[PDB]
Amino acid sequence: DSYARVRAVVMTRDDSSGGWLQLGGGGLSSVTVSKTLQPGDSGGTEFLVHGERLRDKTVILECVLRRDLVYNKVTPTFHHWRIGDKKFGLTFQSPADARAFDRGIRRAIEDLSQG
C-alpha cells in the first residue's frame, strides 16, 4: 500500500535563520507515502509519510497527513510541508525521484475518502 517509495534525505527547518538542515545530519532514508495504519471504519481520511534512515534503522519522519496538505515544491529536488508549526521536508537524489514522490502525494490525496 505505498503510493511511492524513494530514498531521500529528511529535512528540518532552522527556526532562527529559516534555512533547512539535514535532520540528524542526514544519510539516506527510505521514505514512503502510504495509506494509514489506523483507518478506523472509514475508507481512509488520512495518509502517512514515513521515513526510516537506512544506516541506523531509525524512524526519523512520521507524518499523518490529510486532504488539507499544502505540498511545497521549491526546486526539482527539494520539497517541504508543515503540520501546524512543525516543518518537514525532503531532498531527493534526482528530479525523477521528486516527481515520483509528488505523484504519490497527489495519488494519496485523490484517494482520500469521507470520514
UniProtKB/Swiss-Prot annotation:
Residues 1-112 form the WH1 domain. Palmitoylated by ZDHHC17/HIP14. It is found in: Cell membrane. Signal peptide: none annotated. Tyrosine kinase substrate that inhibits growth-factor-mediated activation of MAP kinase. This is Sprouty-related, EVH1 domain-containing protein 1. It comes from Xenopus tropicalis. The lineage of its organism: Eukaryota, Metazoa, Chordata, Craniata, Vertebrata. The gene is spred1.
